[PDB]
Design a protein around this nucleic acid. Structure first.
Lengths: 91, 70, 117, 234
RNA sequence: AGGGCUACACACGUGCUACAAUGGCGCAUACAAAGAGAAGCGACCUCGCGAGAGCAAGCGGACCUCAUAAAGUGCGUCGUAGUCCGGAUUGGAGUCUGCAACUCGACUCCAUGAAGUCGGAAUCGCUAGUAAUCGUGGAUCAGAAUGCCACGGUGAAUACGU
RNA sequence: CGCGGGGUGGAGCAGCCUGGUAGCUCGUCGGGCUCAUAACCCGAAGAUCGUCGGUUCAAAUCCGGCCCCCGCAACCA
RNA sequence: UGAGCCUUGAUGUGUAGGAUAGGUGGGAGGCUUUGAAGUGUGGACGCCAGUCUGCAUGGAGCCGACCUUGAAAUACCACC
């Protein structure tokens, strides 16, 4: 297994996004480039739009996803299935 | 009523007013107020950064580096 | 005296023989024998049943297989209803620990396959 | 198999000519053509004109002879549960289950006949169809398969003989020793002939006895014109 | 700044190691060459199952260290059952380089435990320190070698004939 | 009346007799080869072997029953 | 020369088995020069030299009950 080693991360980018977001409880989805960032208690009930490189994809932040990174809910690679080859695109 | 085909009565006909004496009478939360994940929710419970045990030696509060030293 | 029966290699020395009551690969077995006062280079045929009891009691604390195979079952399934990437790679069957998918999918996703064209 | 050896060559010299014989002169000749140090046994080959297809159209069973043969007839009792003494007092050697289930499985039996209970026979002895020439298993068709085992021991030691077909209408059956007189022998003969005749089908009103040939054991054989209906030498 | 070629329905080129017992298991046991270590590595140290941790004499490398070189040997042990070969996967915990290890990073290690019994079509180097086979170090080098380069262990059949 | 032969992957065949072992030509689908085209090589899938039951470690085969197709039987007159 | 009827005579080279497996009853062996076997002579007799074997001489053997392999077991006489 892999880990986060030993130091403390809160991410600089989510600290400053979250501080302005919490004050209303919630507002419209926060435009996020931070795919490096873990999910945290401070972020519970926010809606984080996560750039995947092509576009932002909405991740709804909630208690069950705190063991995880923002970049896990938001996808990257495309899988061609083998019922039959993928004919179409998905955005 | 066909009595005999119904299972034994030890805890049936006895004591419909019973305690929690070996087992509870009612569970909480099974009517699902949040949808069930079957997960323990990590870094919510618990810690994002690992335990420090092993390599227990007196801390140096002023900057130090093992290859930066000769 | 068979530890547990079903698969033990017969007239085999004691260290490999115990990998069939489960929860005890070689390392834990080594320490379990040391406790009971048993040497490694004995064969497992030489022992009275009361040593077999002293062994079984020291195994019986470690993880039961019934729980071990449940632990991997519940670990993929949890991830898999969540939609984290860990859980998505388990969904397709592909490797999760960095292995190729253009090659070396076989141990998880099964034999090589016909492709219509 | 019938390999060409010494013990037949001497007998084959001592014969005068091979031809089909009147039964009383077949028996007097056959007694001359024993050779062995052991007392030879006498049995009869009778060709039956029945169809000989499975059972309906077969002749199957046993009879008790009025005079017994000079052989012992090695009877075993294959059962799961009997009082041993009661079966031994009838004349049996061995009563049990494990030893007789073991033989009929392995495919070799020390014993010539086994008497079986229905509960022994069912698992081992009942299926076997290509059973060889040593005849190990119990059979229903013979009538040796009975729960009245102690009865079957007492009629086996006193004189009970069997008849059965192969793939053909031929019945070979024990008639006695070469030790015996001609009268006693014709008397054994006629008792068998009457039992196969009682068991004969209704379609067997044509030609029934086709050929008769009489045999002795280690020693050679003598062809017969027919068996006749008589219990006497004259 | 994030994402990718490291994708997956697969085929193919190559190399690795294996499919045993010539070996592997346990315990005991042996000797390398060559080179790297000035920004760096490093005995003893105390902690740690190990990895690693935090301290540090010392070094200039024929002094100290990477590094226990492995294969091979000793003894006792194993029979085709994918095992007593082979050990991949995966769960889980400890550790690491870096704001940051999710798809796409490294290491230790616990438990369970598959494919594969020499493989169709295809398919290559070799004349002897070679071929085969076993391990090592280094170049590169944030973090990662099956590869490349060289080194030493152990070291083959035969070359009639055109 | 009676005798005797046959019932195979989607299509036509082989194997058969004390047996196991699905084999040949097609149609199908995937791969390989040659500098390339070319012919050619290689694998796979496909069956209750007419259907039922029995013996045996083994049945398409041997054994018992049933439905179907055909030659002869010169027969329905 | 078919068919019927009939006198005697044999090979059986199995997956597993030392070799000798048509179905199967009698039935536990033939000691007769050891039943042998054996160079040698002939004979039955075949998945081609293999199973069995007559005999001057030969006390040296098929091969079971047993010992052993198999679904079935084996001698030797019969029956076909």
């Amino acid at each position: 297994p892999r880990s986060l080693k030993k130091g403390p991360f809160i991410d600089l980018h989510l600290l400053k996004k979250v501080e302005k977001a919490v004050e209303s409880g919630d507002k419209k989805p926060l435009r996020t480039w931070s795919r490096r960032s873990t999910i945290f208690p401070n972020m519970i009930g926010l809606t984080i739009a996560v750039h995947n490189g092509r576009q932002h994809v909405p991740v709804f932040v909630t208690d069950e996803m705190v063991g995880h990174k923002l970049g896990e809910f938001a996808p990257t690679r495309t899988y061609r299935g083998h019922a039959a080859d993928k004919k179409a695109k998905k955005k | 009523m066909k009595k005999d085909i119904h299972p034994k009565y030890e805890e049936i006909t006895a004591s419909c007013s019973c305690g929690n004496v070996m087992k509870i009478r009612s569970t909480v939360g099974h009517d699902l107020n949040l949808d069930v994940c079957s997960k323990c929710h990590p870094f919510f419970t618990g810690k994002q950064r690992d335990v420090a045990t092993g390599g227990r030696v007196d801390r140096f509060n002023k900057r130090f580096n093992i290859p930066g030293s000769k | 005296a068979r530890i547990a029966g079903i698969n033990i290699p017969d007239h085999k020395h004691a260290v490999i023989a115990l990998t069939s009551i489960y929860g005890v690969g070689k390392t834990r077995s080594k320490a379990i024998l040391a406790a009971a006062g048993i040497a490694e280079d004995v064969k497992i045929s030489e022992l009275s049943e009361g040593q077999i009891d002293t062994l079984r009691d020291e195994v019986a604390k470690f993880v039961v297989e019934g729980d071990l195979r449940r632990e991997i079952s519940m670990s993929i399934k949890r991830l898999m209803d969540l939609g984290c990437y860990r859980g998505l790679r388990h969904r397709r069957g592909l490797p999760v620990r960095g292995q190729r998918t253009k090659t070396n999918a076989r141990t998880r996703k099964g034999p090589r396959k016909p492709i219509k064209k | 198999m019938a390999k060409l050896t010494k013990r037949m060559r001497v007998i084959r010299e001592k014969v005068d000519a091979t031809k089909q014989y009147d039964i009383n002169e077949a028996i007097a000749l056959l007694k001359e053509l024993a050779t062995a140090k052991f007392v030879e046994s006498v049995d009869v080959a009778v060709n039956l004109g029945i169809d000989a297809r499975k059972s309906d159209q077969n002749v199957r069973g046993a009879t008790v002879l009025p005079h017994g043969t000079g052989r012992s007839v090695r009877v075993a009792v294959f059962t799961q549960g009997a009082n041993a003494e009661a079966a031994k007092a009838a004349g049996a050697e061995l009563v049990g289950m494990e030893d007789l289930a073991d033989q009929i499985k392995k495919g070799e039996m020390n014993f010539d006949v086994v008497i079986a209970s229905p509960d022994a026979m069912r698992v081992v002895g009942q299926l076997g169809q290509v059973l060889g020439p040593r005849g190990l298993m119990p059979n229903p068709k013979v009538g040796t398969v009975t729960p009245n085992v102690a009865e079957a021991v007492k009629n086996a030691k006193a004189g009970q003989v069997r008849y059965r077909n192969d793939k053909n209408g031929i019945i070979h059956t024990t008639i006695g020793k070469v030790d015996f007189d001609a009268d006693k022998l014709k008397e054994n003969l006629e008792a068998l002939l009457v039992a196969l005749k009682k068991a004969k089908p209704t379609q067997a009103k044509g030609v029934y006895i086709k050929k008769v040939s009489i045999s002795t054991t280690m020693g050679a054989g003598v062809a017969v014109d027919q068996a006749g209906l008589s219990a006497s030498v004259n």
